[PDB]
Amino acid sequence: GSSGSSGPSTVPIMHQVSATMRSITLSWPQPEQPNGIILDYEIRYYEKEHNEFNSSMARSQTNTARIDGLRPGMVYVVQVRARTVAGYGKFSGKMCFQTLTDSGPSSG
């Protein structure tokens, strides 16, 4: 983001709670400088190999949402943003969340 209109704050980091083989659960803290009322929280996920262009977007009515429609044992770059009546906010710290692996992880 650059030379853009002043938008709402953004989450510093993202915290995960759980995840499935065909989905993933995540969570993020609520900002203090939302520059207004946070309508909803939008999220963007895409294949670590793929780019933004070909990505999926999904918002929620809370600071907690889960992504459905993923492959088992695959990393997915998920991000959360803050949207308000004023405009869209920047994305939170980039994170990589992978799904469950049904292969048999020796160590981890």
From Swiss-Prot:
Residues 8-102 form the Fibronectin type-III domain. It is found in: Cell membrane; Early endosome membrane; Cell projection, Dendrite. Preferentially expressed in brain. Phosphorylated. Autophosphorylation is stimulated by the ligand EFNB1. Required for interaction with SH2 domain-containing interactors, for activation of the MAPK/ERK and JUN signaling cascades and for ubiquitination by CBL. Ubiquitinated; (EFNB1)ligand-induced poly- and/or multi-ubiquitination by CBL is regulated by SRC and leads to lysosomal degradation. Glycans are attached at N54. Receptor tyrosine kinase which binds promiscuously transmembrane ephrin-B family ligands residing on adjacent cells, leading to contact-dependent bidirectional signaling into neighboring cells. The signaling pathway downstream of the receptor is referred to as forward signaling while the signaling pathway downstream of the ephrin ligand is referred to as reverse signaling. Cognate/functional ephrin ligands for this receptor include EFNB1, EFNB2 and EFNB3. Heterotetramer upon binding of the ligand. The heterotetramer is composed of an ephrin dimer and a receptor dimer. Oligomerization is probably required to induce biological responses. Interacts with EPHB6; transphosphorylates EPHB6 to form an active signaling complex. Interacts with PICK1. The ligand-activated form interacts (residues within the catalytic domain) with GRB2 (via SH2 domain). Belongs to the protein kinase superfamily. Tyr protein kinase family. Ephrin receptor subfamily. This is Ephrin type-B receptor 1. It comes from Homo sapiens (Human). The chain holds residues 434 to 528 of 984 of the full protein.
